[PDB]
Amino acid sequence: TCPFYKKIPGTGFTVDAFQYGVVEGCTAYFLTHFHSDHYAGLSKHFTFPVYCSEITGNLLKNKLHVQEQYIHPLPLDTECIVNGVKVVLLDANHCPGAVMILFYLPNGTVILHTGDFRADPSMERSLLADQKVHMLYLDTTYCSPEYTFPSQQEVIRFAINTAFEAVTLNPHALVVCGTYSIGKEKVFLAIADVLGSKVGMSQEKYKTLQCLNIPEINSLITTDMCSSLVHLLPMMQINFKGLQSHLKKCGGKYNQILAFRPTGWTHSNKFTRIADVIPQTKGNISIYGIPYSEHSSYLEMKRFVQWLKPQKIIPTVNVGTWKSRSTMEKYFREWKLEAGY
Ligand code: NI
């Protein structure tokens, strides 16, 4: 049945709750972002109001064929009224179109639902600074101190420098990047820009990117694989067998592959700096796993919460085991005692 952490008290609202059939009492279904664990259940047969960003609404119409009459896009950073309740959508610094949601309850309570997010100090100067938040529905994906990772900027610098060196040494090397959802576009777009190529991809993936309001996108992507030396493939194909196969398909235009797998966290992070990352190599194929995250590190999460000072925290991630829930609750108390709230 729908879990409590997907319901907003004192309203008829749910968040990212599309796989439970008709949730009894629900007058408006909010969707924070277009990732499958969150939209699971939507289709052209859905006949309740969906509230989301413009970009998530483009994807709902074009990719899942949700009928337009049920899509309610809201602009960001703008006080809106939904079924008599003031709400605001904020940038979540996750994937394109991803938002957090501020609810202003008729009784005076204010609730923030982070959706999936990567906390940033820039959030401390949004409309969040303007009033107190009583309850926080928190993306706790990496809520444990082992989860450190570098800035997105440091990761993209490593990727750009590695790709540029490789192709300048061997003008017959092909660069391949994995994907299985929206998000992490900067990885392949940054590499294509430094090499003076467009990124080549499948028609399905091309259609998905054309829904994202990215500036000058017609200039950066293409479905003509022959004219491109950065190819995007399913993440499943980023292994030695899949890459050898793809190389055969290119008809001897290329004699080497340099491939990137943008993972979240991997336990090479506890020890290894970004400067010291190495690939796995077999023959003329090298694969780099790079720690490009769209979720908060532990420290980023902690800073956000200690700045916000909520009265109650409700985790939305890693809630399925008693040891995980108990561990998170211990961190929340440490943070509260250290900061004084
Ligand atoms: Ni997500």
Sign of the dihedral through C-alpha 76, 299, 5, 336:
negative
**Both tokens of residue 157?**
């610098």
- What whole-number distance in Å separates Cα of residue 68 and Cα of residue 60? 9
C-alpha–C-alpha distance, residues 69 and 67, integer Å = 6
CB 138 within 8 A of CB 111: no
Q: CA separation (Å) from 295 to 2, 35, 179?
A: 24, 13, 16
Other C-beta atoms lying within 10 Å of the C-beta of residue 218: 9
Bridge partners of residue 30, in order along the sequence: 15, 51
Q: How far is the CA of 186 from the centre of ligand 1 (A)?
A: 16
Ligand 1: distance of its center to the CA of 329 in Å?
22
> How far apart (Å, rounded) are the C-alpha atoms in residues 290 and 272?
12
Bridge partner residues of 135 (DSSP): 111, 312
CB neighbour list of residue 77: distance below 8 Å, 6 or more residues apart: 88, 89, 90, 91, 126, 127
Ligand 1 center–CA 116 separation, angstroms: 5
Decide: 291 and 149 in contact? Cβ < 8 Å.
yes
Resolution, given in Å to one decimal, reads 1.4
- Distance between Cα 196 and ligand 1 center (Å): 30
Tokens standing for residue 255: 């004699």
Task: Report the distance separating Cα 336 and Cα 189, nearest Å.
Answer: 40
| Helices and strands of the chain, counted as H and E runs | 8, 18
Going from the Cα of 250 to the center of ligand 1, the distance in angstroms, rounded, reads 33
Spacing, Cα 181 to ligand 1 middle (Å): 9
What distance in Å separates the CA atoms of residue 148 and residue 166, rounded to the nearest whole number?
Answer: 28
Q: Of 204, 211, 183, 218, whose CA–CA distance to 56 is shortest?
A: 211
How many angstroms does the Cα of residue 208 sit away from the middle of ligand 1?
16
CA of 223 to the centre of ligand 1 (A): 26
Ligand 1 center to 94 CA (angstroms): 7
The domain 1-147+296-341 is classified under which CATH number: 3.60.15.10, 3.40.50.1000, 1.10.3720.10, 3.40.50.2300?
Answer: 3.60.15.10
- Which residue type is seen at 1? T
The SS3 assignment for 320 reads: coil
Determine the distance separating the centroid of ligand 1 and the alpha carbon of 262, expressed in angstroms: 14
Q: Where in the chain is the domain with CATH 3.60.15.10?
A: 1-147+296-341
For ligand 1, the distance from its centroid to the CA atom of residue 59, given in whole angstroms, is 15
**Full DSSP string of 64-112:** S---GGGEEE--TT--EEETTEEEEEEE-SSSTT-EEEEEE-TTS-EEE
Among 3.40.50.1360, 3.30.70.260, 3.40.1190.20, 3.40.50.12650, name the CATH number for the domain at 148-295: 3.40.50.12650
Residue 253 alpha carbon to ligand 1 centre in Å: 37
The length of the chain, given as a count of residues? 341
Instruction: Report CA(95)–ligand 1 centroid distance (Å).
Output: 7
Residues of the chain with CATH 3.40.50.12650: 148-295
41 CB-near residues (< 8 Å, 6+ apart): 18, 19, 20
User: What method was applied to determine this entry?
Assistant: X-ray
| Whole-number Å distance between alpha carbons of 41 and 291 | 30
For residue 297, report the distance from its CA to the centre of ligand 1, in Å.
15
Give the other-Cβ count within 10 Å of 222's Cβ: 17
Rounded to whole angstroms, the Cα distance separating 203 from 224 reads: 10
Going from the Cα of 93 to the center of ligand 1, the distance in angstroms, rounded, reads 11
**CA 168, 170, 173, 177 torsion-angle sign:** negative
- Side by side, which strands form the sheet with 50-52? 7-8, 13-15, 28-30, 50-52, 71-73
CB 126 within 8 A of CB 117: no
Q: What is the distance in A from the centroid of ligand 1 to the CA of 164?
A: 30
In the chain, what's the furthest Cα-to-Cα distance?
68
Q: What spacing in Å lies between the alpha carbon of 123 and ligand 1's midpoint?
A: 18
Judge contact between 130 and 308, C-beta under 8 A: no
Residue 328 C-alpha to ligand 1 middle, in angstroms? 20
Phi, psi of 208 (to 5 degrees): -55, -50
Angle at 59 between CA 57 and CA 62, to 5 degrees: 110
Segments in the chain forming alpha helices (H): 36-39, 54-63, 152-169, 185-195, 203-210, 240-249, 298-308, 322-339
Do residues 288 and 166 lie in contact, with contact meaning Cβ atoms separated by under 8 Å? no
